[PDB]
Design a protein around this ligand. Sequence first.
Ligand SMILES: O=C(O[C@@H]1Cc2c(O)cc(O)cc2O[C@@H]1c1cc(O)c(O)c(O)c1)c1cc(O)c(O)c(O)c1
Ligand SMILES: O=C(O[C@@H]1Cc2c(O)cc(O)cc2O[C@@H]1c1cc(O)c(O)c(O)c1)c1cc(O)c(O)c(O)c1
Length: 146
Amino acid sequence: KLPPGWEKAMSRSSGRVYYFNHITNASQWERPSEPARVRCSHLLVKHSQSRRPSSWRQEKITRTKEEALELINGYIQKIKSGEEDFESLASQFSDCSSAKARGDLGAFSRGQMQKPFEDASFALRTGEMSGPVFTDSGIHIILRTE
Ligand SMILES: O=C(O[C@@H]1Cc2c(O)cc(O)cc2O[C@@H]1c1cc(O)c(O)c(O)c1)c1cc(O)c(O)c(O)c1
Ligand SMILES: O=C(O[C@@H]1Cc2c(O)cc(O)cc2O[C@@H]1c1cc(O)c(O)c(O)c1)c1cc(O)c(O)c(O)c1
């Protein structure tokens, strides 16, 4: 039995099975391996429909949801290939002020964060990273650190 959110799927290009998580939007070839609090970092990319279309990076955020998702997807690719660390990309590109702490949000319990972010955070095991996670803030890559 796979951990919460995890399902088995089949690659359309290769035919090999892989696993994906409908809570975190994580996807991976490898078969995957609750606390009161978790600690996470996150890289946020805002779009024009974000609850506040503004950040420390850009006074007015005009990119579309679709453009934001492409950016998030490129960052996940660089992180997964090891070309860049999550921390480096968060510091340079995240629209959240936690960028200045390499994305770190510190520790939190259920009841504090936006719900899709929270659910993703608590479905990650320590060390694991989400796929694109959508909230009223924009699109997040989430990394569970504790
Ligand atoms: O539906 C296929 O792709 C989906 C749409 C799509 C696209 O439009 C452009 C692109 O860059 C990637 C891409 O990934 C999609 C996709 C979805 C899956 O669930 C999947 O397992 C996969 O390998 C891929 C598909 C079917 C195929 O039969 C196939 O041989 C293939 O290589 C791909
Ligand atoms: O401009 C942002 O903060 C404002 C300026 C600022 C600063 O220069 C240094 C500092 O120590 C704190 C600080 O608080 C300001 C602030 C203003 C608000 O109206 C607000 O709601 C808020 O959370 C905070 C900002 C951008 C962001 O992108 C962001 O994620 C964020 O939380 C905050």
